[PDB]
Amino acid sequence: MKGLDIQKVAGTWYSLAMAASDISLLDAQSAPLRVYVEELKPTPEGDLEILLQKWENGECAQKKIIAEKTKIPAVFKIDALNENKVLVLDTDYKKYLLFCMENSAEPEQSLACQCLVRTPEVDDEALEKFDKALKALPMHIRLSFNPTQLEEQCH
Amino acid sequence: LIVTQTMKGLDIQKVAGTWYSLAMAASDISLLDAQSAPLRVYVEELKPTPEGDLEILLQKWENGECAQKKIIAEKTKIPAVFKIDALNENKVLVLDTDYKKYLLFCMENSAEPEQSLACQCLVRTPEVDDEALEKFDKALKALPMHIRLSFNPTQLEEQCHI
Ligand SMILES: CCCCCCCCCCCCOS(=O)(=O)O
Ligand SMILES: CCCCCCCCCCCCOS(=O)(=O)O
Ligand SMILES: CCCCCCCCCCCCOS(=O)(=O)O
């Protein structure tokens, strides 16, 4: 996607759907890449704070990741445990956001994608765009959640 | 669910032999998610019985080993529909097949049809058949699936798709 206005993706988001290239990365509620985005907050430094949930050590834990802008407008660099690049595939700011995360050292084995939406409702158009994008990427696991799970901690 | 194969009739003799679980999908994530999830089963062989029933050799990951089991799917008065004695799955529905390449089937609890629904795409050889996967996806479009899994040929050739 050509260009991102960070100010315009601020606020609450819900992880409506996920997909990954390796099954074991989303294989469990405690799988390494099973993360639920909650809020995107621009920082005074111009970076993007990501508030998300992850099942860790037997509890739903909050994690804070900083996405720094790069020379490519849709690509960010995150200091995270298992991923280091986030690519925003598509967004309308107002309804949905499609992104992918990967570890640049192992791009194929680490690729995961998510469909984020602004409200805890099944956005069929967002899921259609997400599936169309996934058609061209080597995904072997796909997960989708219902609004009740979307309103629960760690779904 | 529409058992499309019911109209065409099912010839058990022509489904005999080796099969590979290329893809699976389920309405409830927790039933198919983990490697030891209850409905994460891998069909190995179909063997018609003298009674017209269908013996099924399958693999299942349990307690850090995988295990093999033989189950008997019993014929019914409706073609492509079978009864299986399992803890919480009791009906197998053969959605589609061409006998020579792919076989789309589903398993469900008739008592709890939607929360228990799982479906699989079986193929004759350990290769990715994207036509089979496309028929599988078209069938899944009308089912309330929330998890989908597909495997690569090496996993197809491995015990328990390890
Ligand atoms: C019988 C368990 C019910 C748990 C419901 C949790 C639903 C959240 C999404 C599925 C993750 C769960 O996947 S799991 O394989 O780790 O259980
Ligand atoms: C423009 C912002 C769009 C990105 C929002 C979601 C990115 C969060 C990625 C989590 C990485 C998880 O990394 S991990 O090491 O904890 O598994
Ligand atoms: C070509 C048709 C193949 C049909 C295979 C059906 C496999 C049955 C798996 C039941 C899982 C067991 O679940 S349980 O929890 O109830 O024991």
From Swiss-Prot, chain A:
Q: Which cysteines does the record link by disulfide bonds?
A: 60-154, 100-113, 100-115
**Gene Ontology cellular-component annotations:** extracellular region
Q: How is it modified after translation?
A: Alternate disulfide bonds occur in equal amounts in all variants examined.
Q: Which key words are in the record?
A: Allergen, Disulfide bond, Milk protein, Retinol-binding, Secreted, Signal, Transport
The protein's GO terms of the molecular function aspect are: identical protein binding; long-chain fatty acid binding; retinol binding
* Cellular localisation: Secreted
State the family named in the UniProt similarity comment for this chain. Belongs to the calycin superfamily. Lipocalin family.
Please give the subunit comment from the record.
Under physiological conditions beta-lactoglobulin exists as an equilibrium mixture of monomeric and dimeric forms. Interaction with LMBR1L which mediates the endocytosis of LGB has been observed in PubMed:17991420, but not in PubMed:23964685.
Identify the PANTHER family for this entry: GLYCODELIN, LIPOCALIN
The protein in question is named Beta-lactoglobulin
Q: Which organism is it from?
A: Bos taurus (Bovine)
Swiss-Prot record, chain B:
Principal localisation: secreted
Entry's localization field? Secreted
**Keywords linked to the UniProt accession:** Allergen, Disulfide bond, Milk protein, Retinol-binding, Secreted, Signal, Transport
Could you tell me which cysteines form disulfide bridges? 66-160, 106-119, 106-121
Transferase listed as a keyword: no
For this UniProt entry, the molecular function terms from Gene Ontology, in alphabetical order, are: identical protein binding; long-chain fatty acid binding; retinol binding
The GO cellular component terms are: extracellular region
Q: Which Gene3D superfamilies match?
A: 2.40.128.20
Q: Which SUPFAM superfamilies match?
A: Lipocalins
CDD domains on file: lipocalin_beta-LG-like
Q: Cite the post-translational modification comment.
A: Alternate disulfide bonds occur in equal amounts in all variants examined.
Summary of the tissues where the protein is detected: Synthesized in mammary gland and secreted in milk.
Please tell me whether the keyword Transport is annotated for this protein.
yes
Please explain the role this protein plays, according to its UniProt record.
Answer: Primary component of whey, it binds retinol and is probably involved in the transport of that molecule.
Q: Which family does it belong to?
A: Belongs to the calycin superfamily. Lipocalin family.
Listed under subunit, the entry gives: Under physiological conditions beta-lactoglobulin exists as an equilibrium mixture of monomeric and dimeric forms. Interaction with LMBR1L which mediates the endocytosis of LGB has been observed in PubMed:17991420, but not in PubMed:23964685.
**Listed name of the protein:** Beta-lactoglobulin
The source organism is Bos taurus (Bovine)
Question: By which gene is this protein encoded?
Answer: LGB
